[PDB]
Design a protein around this motif. Structure first.
Motif, PDB file in Angstrom:
ATOM      1  N   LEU A   1       0.699 -10.621 -12.794  1.00  0.00           N
ATOM      2  CA  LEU A   1       0.271  -9.966 -11.561  1.00  0.00           C
ATOM      3  C   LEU A   1       0.346 -10.928 -10.383  1.00  0.00           C
ATOM      4  N   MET A   2      -0.034 -12.186 -10.608  1.00  0.00           N
ATOM      5  CA  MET A   2       0.029 -13.196  -9.558  1.00  0.00           C
ATOM      6  C   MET A   2       1.470 -13.457  -9.133  1.00  0.00           C
ATOM      7  N   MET A   3       2.376 -13.583 -10.107  1.00  0.00           N
ATOM      8  CA  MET A   3       3.793 -13.764  -9.800  1.00  0.00           C
ATOM      9  C   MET A   3       4.311 -12.633  -8.924  1.00  0.00           C
ATOM     10  N   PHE A   4       4.015 -11.391  -9.311  1.00  0.00           N
ATOM     11  CA  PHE A   4       4.500 -10.239  -8.558  1.00  0.00           C
ATOM     12  C   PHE A   4       3.912 -10.210  -7.152  1.00  0.00           C
ATOM     13  N   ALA A   5       2.586 -10.329  -7.048  1.00  0.00           N
ATOM     14  CA  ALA A   5       1.910 -10.112  -5.771  1.00  0.00           C
ATOM     15  C   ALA A   5       2.226 -11.212  -4.765  1.00  0.00           C
ATOM     16  N   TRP A   6       2.250 -12.471  -5.210  1.00  0.00           N
ATOM     17  CA  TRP A   6       2.472 -13.568  -4.271  1.00  0.00           C
ATOM     18  C   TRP A   6       3.913 -13.610  -3.780  1.00  0.00           C
ATOM     19  N   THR A   7       4.858 -13.103  -4.574  1.00  0.00           N
ATOM     20  CA  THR A   7       6.255 -13.090  -4.156  1.00  0.00           C
ATOM     21  C   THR A   7       6.508 -12.087  -3.035  1.00  0.00           C
ATOM     22  N   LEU A   8       5.594 -11.139  -2.820  1.00  0.00           N
ATOM     23  CA  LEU A   8       5.758 -10.209  -1.709  1.00  0.00           C
ATOM     24  C   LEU A   8       5.659 -10.913  -0.360  1.00  0.00           C
ATOM     25  N   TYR A   9       4.935 -12.038  -0.290  1.00  0.00           N
ATOM     26  CA  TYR A   9       4.748 -12.705   0.999  1.00  0.00           C
ATOM     27  C   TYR A   9       6.031 -13.341   1.518  1.00  0.00           C
ATOM     28  N   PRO A  10       6.788 -14.123   0.735  1.00  0.00           N
ATOM     29  CA  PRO A  10       8.083 -14.600   1.249  1.00  0.00           C
ATOM     30  C   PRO A  10       9.039 -13.473   1.593  1.00  0.00           C
ATOM     31  N   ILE A  11       8.916 -12.317   0.935  1.00  0.00           N
ATOM     32  CA  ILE A  11       9.741 -11.168   1.294  1.00  0.00           C
ATOM     33  C   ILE A  11       9.382 -10.671   2.688  1.00  0.00           C
ATOM     34  N   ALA A  12       8.083 -10.593   2.993  1.00  0.00           N
ATOM     35  CA  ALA A  12       7.661 -10.224   4.340  1.00  0.00           C
ATOM     36  C   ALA A  12       8.066 -11.280   5.361  1.00  0.00           C
ATOM     37  N   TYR A  13       8.042 -12.555   4.962  1.00  0.00           N
ATOM     38  CA  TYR A  13       8.465 -13.649   5.831  1.00  0.00           C
ATOM     39  C   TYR A  13       9.924 -13.504   6.256  1.00  0.00           C
ATOM     40  N   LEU A  14      10.770 -12.961   5.380  1.00  0.00           N
ATOM     41  CA  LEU A  14      12.199 -12.832   5.633  1.00  0.00           C
ATOM     42  C   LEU A  14      12.574 -11.540   6.349  1.00  0.00           C
ATOM     43  N   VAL A  15      11.616 -10.629   6.556  1.00  0.00           N
ATOM     44  CA  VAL A  15      11.906  -9.380   7.266  1.00  0.00           C
ATOM     45  C   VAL A  15      12.673  -9.604   8.569  1.00  0.00           C
ATOM     46  N   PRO A  16      12.310 -10.570   9.426  1.00  0.00           N
ATOM     47  CA  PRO A  16      13.094 -10.769  10.657  1.00  0.00           C
ATOM     48  C   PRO A  16      14.560 -11.075  10.412  1.00  0.00           C
ATOM     49  N   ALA A  17      14.926 -11.555   9.223  1.00  0.00           N
ATOM     50  CA  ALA A  17      16.320 -11.891   8.962  1.00  0.00           C
ATOM     51  C   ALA A  17      17.167 -10.663   8.649  1.00  0.00           C
ATOM     52  N   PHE A  18      16.594  -9.634   8.015  1.00  0.00           N
ATOM     53  CA  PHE A  18      17.381  -8.480   7.604  1.00  0.00           C
ATOM     54  C   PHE A  18      16.942  -7.149   8.205  1.00  0.00           C
ATOM     55  N   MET A  19      15.792  -7.081   8.895  1.00  0.00           N
ATOM     56  CA  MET A  19      15.361  -5.845   9.559  1.00  0.00           C
ATOM     57  C   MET A  19      14.617  -6.199  10.852  1.00  0.00           C
ATOM     58  N   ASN A  20      15.362  -6.706  11.837  1.00  0.00           N
ATOM     59  CA  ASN A  20      14.794  -7.098  13.126  1.00  0.00           C
ATOM     60  C   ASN A  20      14.773  -5.879  14.044  1.00  0.00           C
ATOM     61  N   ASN A  21      13.793  -5.012  13.810  1.00  0.00           N
ATOM     62  CA  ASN A  21      13.545  -3.858  14.665  1.00  0.00           C
ATOM     63  C   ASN A  21      12.093  -3.438  14.473  1.00  0.00           C
ATOM     64  N   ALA A  22      11.694  -2.378  15.180  1.00  0.00           N
ATOM     65  CA  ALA A  22      10.298  -1.955  15.141  1.00  0.00           C
ATOM     66  C   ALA A  22       9.892  -1.456  13.759  1.00  0.00           C
ATOM     67  N   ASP A  23      10.824  -0.865  13.008  1.00  0.00           N
ATOM     68  CA  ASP A  23      10.500  -0.415  11.659  1.00  0.00           C
ATOM     69  C   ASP A  23      10.329  -1.590  10.704  1.00  0.00           C
ATOM     70  N   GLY A  24      10.977  -2.722  10.987  1.00  0.00           N
ATOM     71  CA  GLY A  24      10.747  -3.919  10.195  1.00  0.00           C
ATOM     72  C   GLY A  24       9.386  -4.534  10.445  1.00  0.00           C
ATOM     73  N   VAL A  25       8.869  -4.397  11.668  1.00  0.00           N
ATOM     74  CA  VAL A  25       7.487  -4.778  11.941  1.00  0.00           C
ATOM     75  C   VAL A  25       6.536  -3.960  11.079  1.00  0.00           C
ATOM     76  N   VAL A  26       6.796  -2.655  10.967  1.00  0.00           N
ATOM     77  CA  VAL A  26       5.951  -1.785  10.156  1.00  0.00           C
ATOM     78  C   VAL A  26       6.077  -2.138   8.681  1.00  0.00           C
ATOM     79  N   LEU A  27       7.304  -2.385   8.214  1.00  0.00           N
ATOM     80  CA  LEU A  27       7.504  -2.700   6.804  1.00  0.00           C
ATOM     81  C   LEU A  27       6.811  -4.003   6.425  1.00  0.00           C
ATOM     82  N   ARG A  28       6.825  -4.987   7.326  1.00  0.00           N
ATOM     83  CA  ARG A  28       6.165  -6.257   7.039  1.00  0.00           C
ATOM     84  C   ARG A  28       4.661  -6.071   6.877  1.00  0.00           C
ATOM     85  N   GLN A  29       4.041  -5.302   7.776  1.00  0.00           N
ATOM     86  CA  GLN A  29       2.614  -5.022   7.645  1.00  0.00           C
ATOM     87  C   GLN A  29       2.317  -4.221   6.385  1.00  0.00           C
TER      88      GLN A  29
END
Ligand SMILES: *C/C=C(C)/C=C/C=C(C)/C=C/C1=C(C)CCCC1(C)C
Ligand SMILES: CCCCCCCCCC
Ligand SMILES: CCCCCCCCCC
Ligand SMILES: CCCCCCCCCC
Ligand SMILES: CCCCCC
Ligand SMILES: CCCCCC
Ligand SMILES: CCCCCC
Ligand SMILES: CCCCCC
Ligand SMILES: [Br-]
Ligand SMILES: [Br-]
Ligand SMILES: [Br-]
Length: 265
Positions: free
Chosen positions: A196-224
């Protein structure tokens, strides 16, 4: 060096969804805080600090989520059909500062239910917190450039990922080498907490990379949205499993309030 949130105007639906995500997170953490407080009495003295660390995590995250919510409504105003940035400022950077406190708390309560003690507990906690702080700090510097310097976000994130991997190796090694010491059948439960820790903590670097692949207002929503899933998984669900392991081991060790507590359910 702005954040991508400051770049866009938001529809009413986008704005209120983000606000409702943050306010929902506040309610979940403060509702869990009450639960952790009440069940504290059903945990043996040796494990009780792990449940107290859940209480600290709930208020720490809940305060920063409430902080983010009001800053969101302070910085934007609905003008000419959309929410537009006003005089004030919003930033995910306050999340990173808070992680400096909440991540050591999450790691400490796992070491406590692993039955580590004394020299090994202090020794393992120091290396894990130092690795985690290096992960957070290099990550914080990296997101300063999520708008200005995408290459720097990538390079600081690679450094951050190196600490993350070494931190997980220490955690996993300790878990699998001390699994035999655990009572009440929680040797089986603790491997589930690691996954569970492996799965949950890996979501944070994914949110960190949102600006690289979804730089728009919907990517702001997806990160939150990713942050919310990750916050609930890594803090609330994780804390319930830690508390379950704490009470189960307390009952197997002869703590009567623990045994009674499990008996009623
Ligand atoms: C409750 C909050 C938690 C458990 C936060 C966890 C944060 C991380 C695992 C951070 C991860 C990062 C990297 C591995 C790379 C990119 C930068 C970070 C700091 C987001
Ligand atoms: C059960 C006590 C939890 C109440 C949460 C309060 C929510 C505050 C939203 C601003
Ligand atoms: C028994 C002491 C705990 C040490 C585990 C590995 C620490 C990592 C050094 C990088
Ligand atoms: C890739 C990060 C995973 C580290 C887990 C290693 C645990 C195995 C120890 C025997
Ligand atoms: C001013 C942005 C928040 C970062 C806290 C160090
Ligand atoms: C940043 C790359 C590290 C991967 C090691 C598994
Ligand atoms: C189906 C959701 C599972 C939640 C268990 C805590
Ligand atoms: C009442 C003890 C159970 C905790 C795990 C849900
Ligand atoms: Br005890
Ligand atoms: Br947090
Ligand atoms: Br091993």
């Amino acid at each position: 060096m702005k954040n991508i949130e400051s770049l866009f105007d938001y529809s009413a639906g986008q704005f209120e969804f983000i606000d409702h995500l943050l306010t929902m997170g506040v309610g979940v953490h403060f509702a869990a805080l009450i639960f952790f407080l009440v069940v504290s009495q059903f945990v043996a003295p040796k494990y009780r600090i792990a449940t107290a660390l859940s209480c600290i995590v709930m208020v720490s995250a809940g305060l920063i989520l409430n902080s983010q919510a009001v800053m969101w409504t302070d910085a934007y105003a609905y003008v000419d059909g959309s929410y537009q940035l006003q005089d004030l400022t919003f930033s995910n950077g306050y999340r990173y500062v808070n992680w400096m406190a909440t991540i050591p708390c999450l790691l400490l309560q796992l070491l406590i239910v692993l039955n580590l003690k004394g020299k090994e507990l202090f020794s393992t906690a120091t290396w894990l917190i130092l690795a985690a702080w290096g992960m957070i700090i290099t990550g914080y510097v990296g997101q300063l450039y999520e708008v200005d310097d995408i290459a720097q976000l990538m390079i600081w994130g690679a450094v951050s990922t190196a600490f993350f991997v070494v931190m997980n190796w220490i955690v996993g090694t300790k878990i699998f080498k001390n699994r035999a010491t655990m009572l009440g059948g929680t040797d089986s439960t603790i491997t589930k907490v690691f996954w569970l820790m492996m799965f949950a903590w890996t979501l944070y670097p994914i949110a960190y990379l949102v600006p690289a692949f979804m730089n728009n207002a919907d990517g702001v929503v997806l990160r939150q949205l990713l942050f919310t899933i990750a916050d609930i998984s890594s803090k609330v669900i994780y804390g319930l499993m830690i508390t379950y392991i704490a009470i189960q081991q307390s009952a197997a060790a002869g703590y009567v309030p623990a045994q009674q507590a499990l008996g009623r359910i």
